[PDB]
Design an enzyme around this catalytic site. Structure first.
Site, PDB file in Angstrom:
ATOM      1  N   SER A 281     -38.333  -4.561   6.357  1.00  0.00           N
ATOM      2  CA  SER A 281     -37.457  -3.853   5.306  1.00  0.00           C
ATOM      3  C   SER A 281     -36.491  -2.707   5.990  1.00  0.00           C
ATOM      4  O   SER A 281     -36.982  -1.750   6.240  1.00  0.00           O
ATOM      5  CB  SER A 281     -38.461  -3.160   4.473  1.00  0.00           C
ATOM      6  OG  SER A 281     -37.617  -2.576   3.507  1.00  0.00           O
TER       7      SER A 281
ATOM      8  N   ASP B  57     -47.239  -1.324   5.607  1.00  0.00           N
ATOM      9  CA  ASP B  57     -48.140  -0.855   4.787  1.00  0.00           C
ATOM     10  C   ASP B  57     -49.296  -1.810   4.884  1.00  0.00           C
ATOM     11  O   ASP B  57     -48.906  -3.005   5.166  1.00  0.00           O
ATOM     12  CB  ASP B  57     -47.996  -0.114   3.630  1.00  0.00           C
ATOM     13  CG  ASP B  57     -47.382  -1.362   2.631  1.00  0.00           C
ATOM     14  OD1 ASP B  57     -47.892  -2.263   2.571  1.00  0.00           O
ATOM     15  OD2 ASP B  57     -46.441  -1.124   2.022  1.00  0.00           O
TER      16      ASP B  57
ATOM     17  N   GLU C 269     -29.368 -10.417  35.003  1.00  0.00           N
ATOM     18  CA  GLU C 269     -30.090  -9.805  33.896  1.00  0.00           C
ATOM     19  C   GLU C 269     -31.129 -10.802  33.359  1.00  0.00           C
ATOM     20  O   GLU C 269     -32.015 -10.714  32.753  1.00  0.00           O
ATOM     21  CB  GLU C 269     -28.997  -9.294  32.993  1.00  0.00           C
ATOM     22  CG  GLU C 269     -28.240  -7.957  33.354  1.00  0.00           C
ATOM     23  CD  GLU C 269     -26.886  -7.773  32.784  1.00  0.00           C
ATOM     24  OE1 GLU C 269     -26.437  -8.718  32.478  1.00  0.00           O
ATOM     25  OE2 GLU C 269     -26.444  -6.683  32.831  1.00  0.00           O
TER      26      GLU C 269
HETATM   27  O1  LIG Z   1     -28.983  -8.458   7.618  1.00  0.00           O
HETATM   28  C1  LIG Z   1     -29.871  -8.606   8.653  1.00  0.00           C
HETATM   29  C2  LIG Z   1     -30.623  -7.545   9.150  1.00  0.00           C
HETATM   30  O2  LIG Z   1     -31.501  -7.182   7.842  1.00  0.00           O
HETATM   31  C3  LIG Z   1     -32.301  -5.812   8.338  1.00  0.00           C
HETATM   32  O3  LIG Z   1     -31.879  -4.628   8.692  1.00  0.00           O
HETATM   33  C4  LIG Z   1     -30.671  -4.293   7.731  1.00  0.00           C
HETATM   34  C5  LIG Z   1     -29.579  -2.996   8.367  1.00  0.00           C
HETATM   35  O4  LIG Z   1     -28.392  -3.817   8.459  1.00  0.00           O
HETATM   36  C6  LIG Z   1     -27.261  -2.866   8.746  1.00  0.00           C
HETATM   37  O5  LIG Z   1     -26.992  -2.265  10.259  1.00  0.00           O
HETATM   38  C7  LIG Z   1     -26.598  -2.803  11.525  1.00  0.00           C
HETATM   39  C8  LIG Z   1     -25.479  -4.151  11.316  1.00  0.00           C
HETATM   40  O6  LIG Z   1     -24.203  -3.742  10.537  1.00  0.00           O
HETATM   41  O7  LIG Z   1     -27.649  -3.428  12.155  1.00  0.00           O
HETATM   42  C9  LIG Z   1     -28.363  -2.947  12.942  1.00  0.00           C
HETATM   43  C10 LIG Z   1     -29.778  -2.672  12.418  1.00  0.00           C
HETATM   44  O8  LIG Z   1     -30.585  -3.946  12.520  1.00  0.00           O
HETATM   45  C11 LIG Z   1     -27.719  -1.591  12.982  1.00  0.00           C
HETATM   46  O9  LIG Z   1     -27.628  -0.971  14.427  1.00  0.00           O
HETATM   47  C12 LIG Z   1     -26.347  -1.783  12.594  1.00  0.00           C
HETATM   48  O10 LIG Z   1     -25.576  -0.550  11.765  1.00  0.00           O
HETATM   49  C13 LIG Z   1     -26.947  -1.747   7.629  1.00  0.00           C
HETATM   50  O11 LIG Z   1     -26.003  -0.975   7.959  1.00  0.00           O
HETATM   51  C14 LIG Z   1     -28.450  -1.354   7.346  1.00  0.00           C
HETATM   52  O12 LIG Z   1     -28.081  -0.258   6.201  1.00  0.00           O
HETATM   53  C15 LIG Z   1     -29.522  -2.009   7.090  1.00  0.00           C
HETATM   54  O13 LIG Z   1     -30.729  -1.364   7.310  1.00  0.00           O
HETATM   55  C16 LIG Z   1     -33.213  -6.301   9.349  1.00  0.00           C
HETATM   56  O14 LIG Z   1     -34.391  -4.973   9.470  1.00  0.00           O
HETATM   57  C17 LIG Z   1     -32.773  -6.523  10.419  1.00  0.00           C
HETATM   58  O15 LIG Z   1     -33.703  -6.885  11.418  1.00  0.00           O
HETATM   59  C18 LIG Z   1     -31.658  -7.881  10.376  1.00  0.00           C
HETATM   60  O16 LIG Z   1     -32.400  -8.721  10.077  1.00  0.00           O
END
Ligand SMILES: OC[C@H]1O[C@H](OC[C@H]2O[C@H](O[C@]3(CO)O[C@H](CO)[C@@H](O)[C@@H]3O)[C@H](O)[C@@H](O)[C@@H]2O)[C@H](O)[C@@H](O)[C@H]1O
Ligand SMILES: OC[C@H]1O[C@H](OC[C@H]2O[C@H](O[C@]3(CO)O[C@H](CO)[C@@H](O)[C@@H]3O)[C@H](O)[C@@H](O)[C@@H]2O)[C@H](O)[C@@H](O)[C@H]1O
Ligand SMILES: OC[C@H]1O[C@H](OC[C@H]2O[C@H](O[C@]3(CO)O[C@H](CO)[C@@H](O)[C@@H]3O)[C@H](O)[C@@H](O)[C@@H]2O)[C@H](O)[C@@H](O)[C@H]1O
Lengths: 721, 721, 228, 246
Positions: A521, A528, A608
């Protein structure tokens, strides 16, 4: 001897090393003792019955009996007790009930609320059934307390029956409550934030009310359904701890109230916020399962008790003791920008470094080229995948890798065929614009047509494709509640949503029980024990920084076993923190969890790649120790610590990982002592071949040596001879 | 296996559950480990040898070996270590020494410094003898470490020999030192003041130097020769504690120094203040015995370890397990205003209430009608006693009472025949007026003629009179040091005074070993383990208030056994505090100590006499439990607590005393849990006849009920069935 | 100078040595400053608008504006702010409202809720009247903030009007709310018990929710209606 | 007493409204009577301080702060009761010993000085007192007639707070040329240096004549050096310093 006993007006609920002893006093249920085993209980710690000013009484002439002053196991409002109530039901012109004990029975074996996640492997359990009635309101409340023969945990839930011939409305219905005697207490909770999940918080219990709660429709990044009431001065190694937790993934509250007499109430359950529940005649409501766990061995004691109970009675048996595959996930590696060539190249490289499972993340479905559309459209993008998903899977399988796939079933984009065909399936209020979050909406899983649709679509996907692993994401919280035909139905939709989710995931996980499902999520937004009933691992945090992961892992494994705790080595500079960390440290930090990889292996140097292949080889060795062994925190990464250290024991194997955050100068080396070894045992340290007695490692300890620099780490590996 | 072992360049000093492991590194002695037993020590916690800036070296070319950074067992100044030194000797033009290890031997059995109190019952001990030499200065320093087979204590002292043919001067010479690795530590000490003795103090170890010391020529009311270095977060029940203590009753210092690297040094010994010691060729100096004691069972663990060691190896065997008589003392009862009639009337009343021993306090000698004269004149005032002391004693004996007598041998009044005959016997400076304290002076017990005189006078008194008990008071501290023929001799007189005192009291206590000697110094002005070697009980405080006694008893029994701890029921309003307390509370508080009575029994009502007779009867029963049993602190009377509670276990007997200081209202009753019972044991509570399992009493506990009022108390008495 | 001022999209409530400065941002009311007097306020301490994960937005395309992250003077549930709400009204099938600022006026002198105890000696006071509407639900919420010329106190209360032609039900309606910037804070309250009234309690502000409350129908011995 | 058994509505919603409607009813009642009989001093009460809030203080200009009339237990109560509310509101009565709530003996002098930090009255059987106790009370009344404007109309300054760990309480009042300070010690102490008590909010150059010794101190002395506070041995002792600015 364990199980349930009824002896005159005492009920004994007896788990391993933990008893709840309840007295029936003329229909009122009194909590006499919760804690270590007592047989032949006499009442040394009974409440002294006194006239307490402004604490009223059920009879005119006896001022010394008051529900304001008796220690109880459930709380009502309106009968003289003014502490926060845990049952409150509207009926006719009132929300006063007066439930009185009428009858007790004992069950053996499997038992739990229908449609809600509950303990398994219950053959060696007994359940106390306390039947209460309010004769006037014609309602029944039945309390269940279940023993476990192998864990210091008691499980609880209740069932409320409407036996009247009018509609009644539940307003409050918690899953567990206990009144503890006035004493000094501290509380530990796991809070934090997105990218800072499960931050361990400790504070003094103070007069008034402290609470953590979610009103987001998911348990949330910033609070976990857990509250630990601790003896003043508890340490990792010593003191009493009572952990109360909830097997539920929606809105919850945990609270501690210190009243005017210094008495202490704790409870956990469904949040009163965003909750009401209509019961028509004959209908009933069952609460989610709460757990109360006890240790007298400090915070490490409670960690072990909680982890063991989760492993044995919550996490799926099929996976609870099964080593988890080292995976590659392409998300941070490519985001949305990938196609078949890139995927197989990444697979090729993953295979060379010995990775076991390849997870295809977001962007494979509908027209999902960014995060502004296509959720709800679970149709394979054969153009982007360069053919059928079946053909991609075969390719991945032929390269020697298991195949995994990302879903986000609970969500719908405005820009989707799903929304074009069924706009009313979104959670929304008639006549209000949507509230948006990551430019998407939430599906109304209280709508049985939504649940039916998702069962069908996903069953099809899983039966027609050879998928080994699923990553189930859920990336926003619930706004704009207004889908009911009445206000009351809207008040029910958040819980009904959870019932819908659990019907869906219990169905799919049961029907496809060979598949490893990992919950997600935006990382740890819903990490949880409700989810861990169906999903034996969880993406602990979107934060993949090795250093920022330290407090996250500390909290994420505090009450949950390490095996659950997804952790990936990612690229530098880190995408969330903008930080360079050594690849060695990224490796050692992820290896304190359930290891995978999330970076573009095709863009790495030869060196790497070699490092990663060595990390994979190392973890293949460490995996049983980490995933199947016993965890011991040695130095905690908190707000002030400059260090982290975690030990794992498994048979003849003991490993210790140490990380230092900031470089130090003219500072004597830390002495790190190991725990829970044989004093006379002989422990051979791999790196120098020296043999140390357990006594030396535990009582003298290791001088920890590092070069100059930030974010350095090392690992000590011992074999008991 | 316990005792001393020499294995290559390691020396192991092995007491029960406590080891000191020392490495000889090219003549330098390194502390490798002090704590729980380790065999086959390899060096996991060795100091990492690094170039530390401004930490110098014994050789030009090796910057990583420095005595500024090595953990040691004795400290020198001038060789590169800048931490506080524990040996410093002036010789020729310098006070730089460089003692180097030359040879080790092992002794078995009885062993200690001559003329200083030291452990007894040493048959099952071994002593490591570390012979060090400074070839240039032609001095030897020999370190002794002794094991005990029945206690987690190691004893230490040193001998310094002058093998040169010039005079040398010792400036510093402590009895024990240890360098502990950088970690977080807290310290516990016993400080306080007159009428507030042995106040328990706890604080964080901070960078810099913390010390307690006496420069009063007695250990003093306001500091005890003890320092407890504790693991961060130690409790009554858990965590490591190292207690360092000194068997010495004169000027001392205990210190903790946290240096620039966060390393921690602790030491105890003779105070450098008011101390220098000349050694002519061939002469030697031995330090008093220090003790290092260890528990991993928290502050109650260290209490038990310290108490047991004192009972077995310090306190006289003749008395360490002998029930002590319930006494009457007339001091608060009459002060100086008494004669034979009053004494025998008081004796008559003491006999009726079952008291066992009658102590005649100050005022029986010379013309001692107040506290302004007569000290030094140990001649019986036959007028005041209405005949010979012999005739008084017979009278007391005939009434069925043992007889005791007060002395203050170390003191002389200006207005005395002693001072008229020998004014030069007082501690004084030529050409300076006296400094006065309680209008008296101190005798110079560094003068062998003074010691001879007191041996003679007191031997006469004890041989010609049938005295069963002596109370040895000492009522001021030492000023105006100037009795030496040289400055150096003056610098020696404070230690020589102690040597004189110990020669005197060891002689008299040995020659009259049937007599119970109780030490005193305006109460607890010199309540230390030097005195407890000869005096098996001590007047803990002049403060006899039941409530003010709570913190005093807490501290007075913290490291010393309860049997030592004089406690008397006295009159109200209390003479020190101006406070009314219930006679019941005065009784119960004194009964947590070594019980006596100190009030005018002839002036009490019939009822008060009856109460006292009941108290005496009760204590005759409780005495073995209190004096011979195991003590458990349940609620500590500190600066913020409103309560005190102390439990004693002895075989089938368990008692608990509870006191509340201020009356409370609308406050829930305390729950008091007992410790160290059998879970399955059955415990019958005397007052209600109810039988409780040990588990109930330990894990549920007693609801403690009191009426409204200040200074109320109650006692619970259990018999294990 | 004290009283109430309306200057472009800023409202200044100015008591002696105490100002509340509120910004109307497209119908949303933002708490810009509560504390010592500032004239000519520019916004040095404005919230930095950032995409905060799981903090949703009133429009699809702007992820940096969120009621989960803006500092406000009243709290609603259901629009993206998940902090505890201070107004919540059931109407039709929902208890989502979206009150938007529509109009401001200023009163002088005596002013207060009918039938409830309120300040007297109000000749030298002004009251800011912030009129909010939820067009869909046909409800009005009016916020009042009153200045005092002789004391560093501001008084507040609200009036909720039902302008619809159905019954509505108020579930939550607090009298004052403020969002304060992240910093370390302590709180002082007066609690205690019967025969121990108004015991002064001090503690650190910690993550989560601390509350004192009475459900006794009287304010009670054990808690006072005050929080510092 | 407090409210239980809510169920008087014709509907559930009306029951949910009755607790607030109760308050509206109370306020209609008390605003009516206090307005119609505005010459009467109304003191609010609720088993002491069960409803001591600013809603009540709108109509009732004083309040019975606590049923606890013990001089010592009153220390934390008065601390809190006057924390946000003016001293004039704060009913405080000299009562009998042993105290009925605490079962405690306290000096009549201390009972007097503690009550005089509030709105003074008396609550004990004056007919059963000795001649001496009657005389003491008459002196207390005379003293408070003098102190009353300073206490009720002046500015309050807490100097030592009676909390859970403090062994002391001290409160100062300034009113024009009058400054008074009351000091109480709970438990008797021994071999403990005397407290130094500094006054607040005086004129540095002002001259302050201390009634008991006639000595004149500058405000700077009283504020920056302070009073060495001397007491005999004993529990629950108190004293008062009275200054006149010249
Ligand atoms: O969509 C696949 C993604 O879904 C979940 O994380 C969502 C996460 O994505 C966004 O941020 C970025 C890319 O733009 O992703 C990484 C975090 O994984 C960030 O460093 C970067 O900003 C949104 O901006 C966030 O609001 C959002 O929470 C899932 O948890 C990921 O593993 C992946 O499957
Ligand atoms: O002289 C006999 C006396 O010696 C020791 O105590 C000395 C103590 O005496 C003085 O104080 C009084 C009497 O004037 O005695 C009690 C304390 O016992 C006090 O309440 C009272 O003031 C001196 O004023 C003190 O300086 C001095 O310390 C011994 O400890 C006593 O037991 C007793 O034997
Ligand atoms: O009824 C007059 C009384 O009402 C309020 O106090 C009520 C108080 O009375 C009771 O307690 C006693 C007498 O039995 O009264 C004093 C306290 O004033 C106590 O020491 C004693 O127990 C009840 O037991 C209590 O429940 C109740 O709160 C009012 O505040 C009083 O001033 C007085 O007017």
């Amino acid at each position: 001897h364990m199980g349930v006993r009824i002896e005159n007006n005492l009920f004994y609920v007896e788990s391993k090393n933990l008893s709840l002893i309840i007295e029936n006093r003329n229909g009122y249920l009194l909590l006499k003792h919760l804690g270590k085993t007592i047989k032949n209980y006499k009442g040394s710690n009974s409440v002294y019955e006194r006239d307490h000013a402004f604490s009223g009484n059920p009879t005119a002439t006896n001022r010394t009996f008051s529900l304001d002053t008796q220690r109880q196991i459930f709380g009502q409002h309106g009968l003289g007790d003014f502490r926060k109530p845990t049952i409150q039901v509207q009926h006719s012109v009132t929300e006063v009930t007066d439930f009185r004990f009428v009858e007790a029975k004992i069950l053996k074996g499997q038992n739990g609320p229908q449609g809600l996640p509950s303990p398994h492997s219950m053959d060696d359990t007994e359940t106390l059934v306390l039947m209460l009635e309010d004769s006037k309101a014609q309602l029944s409340l039945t309390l269940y307390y279940t023993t476990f023969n192998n864990d210091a945990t008691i499980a609880s839930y209740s069932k409320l029956d409407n036996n009247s011939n009018q509609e009644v409305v539940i307003h409050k219905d918690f899953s567990f409550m206990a009144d503890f005697p006035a004493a000094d207490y501290e509380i530990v909770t796991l809070q934090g934030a997105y990218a800072r999940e499960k931050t361990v918080r400790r504070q003094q219990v103070e007069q008034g009310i402290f609470s953590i709660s979610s009103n987001r429709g998911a348990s949330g990044h910033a609070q976990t359904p857990a509250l630990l009431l601790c003896e003043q001065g508890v340490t990792e190694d010593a003191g009493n701890v009572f952990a109360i937790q909830l097997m539920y993934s929606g809105n919850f509250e945990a609270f501690v109230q210190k009243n005017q007499l210094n008495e202490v109430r704790v409870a956990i359950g469904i949040n009163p916020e965003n909750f009401s529940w209509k019961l028509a005649p004959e209908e009933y409501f069952e609460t989610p399962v709460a757990l109360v766990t006890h240790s007298d061995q400090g915070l490490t004691g409670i960690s072990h008790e909680s982890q063991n109970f989760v492993l044995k009675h919550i996490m799926l048996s099929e996976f609870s003791k099964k080593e988890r595959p080292i995976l590659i996930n392409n998300w941070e590696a490519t985001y949305f920008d990938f196609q078949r060539e890139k995927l197989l190249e990444l697979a090729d490289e993953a295979k060379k470094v010995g990775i076991e499972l390849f997870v295809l993340d977001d962007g494979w479905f509908g027209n999902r080229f960014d995060d502004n559309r296509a959720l709800g459209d679970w149709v394979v993008n054969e153009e982007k995948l360069g053919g059928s998903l079946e053909s991609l899977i075969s390719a991945i399988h032929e390269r020697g890798l298991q195949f995994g796939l990302w879903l986000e079933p609970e969500m719908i984009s405005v820009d989707s065929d799903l929304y074009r065909q069924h706009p009313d399936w979104a959670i929304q209020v008639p006549g209000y614009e949507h509230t948006y979050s990551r430019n998407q909406l939430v599906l109304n899983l209280a709508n049985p047509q939504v649940v039916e649709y998702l069962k069908s679509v996903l069953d099809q996907l899983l039966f027609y494709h050879d998928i080994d692993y699923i990553k189930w994401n859920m990336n926003r919280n619930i706004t704009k509640l207004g889908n009911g035909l009445t206000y009351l139905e809207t008040q029910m939709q958040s819980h009904q949503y959870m019932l819908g989710l659990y019907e869906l995931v219990s169905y799919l996980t049961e029907k496809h029980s060979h598949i490893l499902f990992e919950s997600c999520s935006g990382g740890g937004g819903r990490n949880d024990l409700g989810m861990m009933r169906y999903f034996p691992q969880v993406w602990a945090s979107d934060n993949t920084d090795a250093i920022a992961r330290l407090p996250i892992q500390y909290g994420s494994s505090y009450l949950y076993p390490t095996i659950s705790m997804g952790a990936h080595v990612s690229a530098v500079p880190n995408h969330q923190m903008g930080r360079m960390t050594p690849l060695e440290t990224r490796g050692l930090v992820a290896m304190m969890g359930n290891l995978g990889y999330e970076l573009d292996l095709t863009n790495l140097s030869d060196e790497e790649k070699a490092t990663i292949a060595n990390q994979v080889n190392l973890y293949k060795e460490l995996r049983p120790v980490v995933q199947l062994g016993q965890q011991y925190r040695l130095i905690n990464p908190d707000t002030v610590s400059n260090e982290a250290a975690v030990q794992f024991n498994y048979g003849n194997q003991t490993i210790v990982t140490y990380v230092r955050v900031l470089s130090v100068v003219e500072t004597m080396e830390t002495t790190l002592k190991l725990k829970d070894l044989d004093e006379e045992g002989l422990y051979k340290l791999q790196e120098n071949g020296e043999v140390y007695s357990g006594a030396e490692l535990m009582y003298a300890g290791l001088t920890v040596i590092l070069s100059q620099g930030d974010f350095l780490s090392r690992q000590y590996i011992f074999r008991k001879l």
